[PDB]
């Protein structure tokens, strides 16, 4: 099935935030209406956050991740959970080689905030 | 019933991550076997990372998450959620008031790591 | 934090189910927008499915789920995920004594149907 | 990646319950320890229960999930719930066809039970 989409609330902030577990470089692609808002890319085998930033759903409040390593788009698995009916997080892992332990590069989206 | 306690593996590498939305400062604290292990203080209604580690969880497992607002423990929502049987997200929100967005103090722990 | 409050889309068709696990006999009941919808009961140890039942989220969406033994509400615990973006489960256990298995009624909603 | 495959304690009881939601019956294969060991078959429109049972994990705890509907493999999608870091739910959504509803056949396995 597919992964990495998420239908967040139209017109709303939220945050993704990505980190790195990985040899390789990663290109973490955060699109909104099917456009790039924002790129993430960097390199850690240590969890590091290559990338935090807050974006609004807009319109449609379509939002969909992509992760890719030198070009090559890496395999994705997610899920949203909501705790009490209000905190919600739209998770991401991806896997850009063979071990398949899914956090070369992990992102996570989360709404509402302020 | 209780929340912001996870048992992890033993001896496993975590990262810890944290968020604000809340006009109060933040202290979320982390314990592992029952021991301060960080901890991070922050004010930020835009979800900025008030803190982020990567810990061992120690020959117990134990994983807590406290939050508290100048001394104040925050109320706790949490739950684990895993993917594709391999990738695994320990998941807490908190609220330090009446508006119950429970996103005060976000916190998300993720692991393996490397 | 308050728990088996879920906001289903609008005049929306769902499924309800109930679990036991205890040796009290349980009762579950749907509210839908504040009004009971539905009403499960019995006694089991064995994870019976003690009911069923195709409800409709009507105009608010809003759903909550109550669990109680012997006249006494339960403690709950929930939450909410999405896997494809596209299948939705309201999850709720509860817990009618102090051995924390959380299992003694065990409710899964899900929706879409057909 | 792969889903539908779940770690669950080993030696451990466990209930699988399947619901149907397509005008194709339904086959659901559970496997533990990498031998069938339950198969629901049934249809129905209307999310009415096909099957349930109660089963023991093996001696690895694994438990995998297939389903298909006349020979021809559903793509399936899953994740695992663990709330107040005790109560789980093993969740799987299947699709049969290329409306993507993934509801065809919908299995979720809880546990502890009794
Ligand atoms: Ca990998
Ligand atoms: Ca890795
Ligand atoms: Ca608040
Ligand atoms: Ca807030
Ligand atoms: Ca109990
Ligand atoms: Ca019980
Ligand atoms: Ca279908
Ligand atoms: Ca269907």
């Given at each position: ?5 998420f239908?967040l609330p ?12 990985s040899?390789?470089?990663?290109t ?21 956050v290559?990338?935090?930033q ?18 090559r ?32 590069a992990?992102?996570?989206?989360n709404?509402?905030?302020?």
């Amino acid at each position: 099935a597919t992964q990495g989409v998420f239908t967040l609330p139209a017109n709303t902030r939220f945050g993704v935030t990505a980190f790195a577990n990985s040899s390789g470089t990663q290109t973490v692609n955060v699109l909104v209406n099917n456009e790039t808002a924002a790129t993430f890319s960097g390199q850690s085998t240590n969890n590091a956050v290559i990338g935090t930033q807050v974006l609004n759903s807009g319109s449609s409040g379509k939002v969909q991740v992509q992760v890719s390593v030198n070009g090559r788009p890496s395999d994705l698995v997610s899920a949203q959970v909501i705790l009490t009916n209000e905190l919600n997080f739209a998770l991401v892992g991806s896997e850009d080689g063979t071990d398949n332990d899914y956090n070369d590069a992990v992102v996570v989206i989360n709404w509402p905030l302020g």
